[PDB]
Amino acid sequence: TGHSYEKYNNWETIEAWTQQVATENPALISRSVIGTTFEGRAIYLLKVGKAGQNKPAIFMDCGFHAREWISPAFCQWFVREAVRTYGREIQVTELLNKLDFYVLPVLNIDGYIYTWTKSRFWRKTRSTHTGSSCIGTDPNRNFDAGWCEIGASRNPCDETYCGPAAESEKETKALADFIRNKLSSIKAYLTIHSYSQMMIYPYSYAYKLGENNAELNALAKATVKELASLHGTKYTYGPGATTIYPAAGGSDDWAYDQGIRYSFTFELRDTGRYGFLLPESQIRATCEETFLAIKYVASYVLEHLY
């Protein structure tokens, strides 16, 4: 029954919400379509920030994986918090005047709808390719970053299936096309998942470390402290391969190898008690603490431009 920031919203409501928020906040939010899903559904992107010349950007997406409902819930919360507090708190005013945030509320829309009406734990896209009767590819194994080398299945029926080729999915090709086009302005890439309460940086497709590794580790350590400020929520952090697991073809690694020096994957609440089924009553607290983390990272990026 309409949109709420403290409930999970079906796609039709989120879609309506993206237009509403643009219409209600014309100086701060505009909405774009960056492409179309396997099933032909428009994929929306919000640009949050005040008009300005040659603005650097931070790209954040939610809803890679269908069942991770708290992820889209957070992109929505972020947009409201940003506009609500613009011109009222000095940090956020500065951020939106000097930076744009691209916010992609649900990438895997076909999958998201599927979890609402059919199968709550679906993860992948809903595509079909020649050669298999199984459905769906893992969008976070589908990027050109050590594609399908470790931590990815070659079996089309598996949850970590990498696809027939990198960017085989319209959704990931649409995201990669957008970032490639805006590469010279995008300074950070942030991709929101759940669960397990972690902040992860490259690399997941191999055990190597970025040239930047010490700085990334220090930034992660500092932002999880900031996150813990509010409600005491404990996050761990580190390079993906050893901290979570090997996982080739990830969007975080791909973005980093494009030259985006600040590239993180967030894993939100909880640690497994509810898992993917995070109760609606925890949405606010989760989103509040996560907002502090994103703000902290954005402010750091503003002082470390390149």
């Binding site: 009406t117 893992d138 998942h193 669960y195 697991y245 089924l277």
Partner: protein, 74 residues
């Protein structure tokens, strides 16, 4: 979607045992009392070979059977 509004979720019939099924609308499959599911898949996990490095949901690994353990992909 009544099923989801009430705090449950939809699942295929084969994944929701009889005692866990609910009467609420919203699903083209069936509304399931997810809190009553057990086993790896019932927790959003996937059974994998023992030598697959993953984040294991250890309490559900026995449900995966021989040579298999419960991984949750995040």
């Amino acid at each position: 979607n009544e099923c989801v509004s009430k705090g449950f979720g939809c699942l295929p019939q084969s994944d929701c045992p009889q005692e866990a099924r609910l009467s609420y609308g919203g699903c083209s499959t069936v509304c399931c009392d997810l809190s009553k599911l057990t086993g790896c898949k019932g927790k959003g996990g996937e059974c994998n070979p023992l030598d697959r490095q993953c984040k294991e949901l250890q309490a559900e690994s026995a449900s995966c059977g021989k040579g298999q353990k419960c991984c949750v992909w995040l």
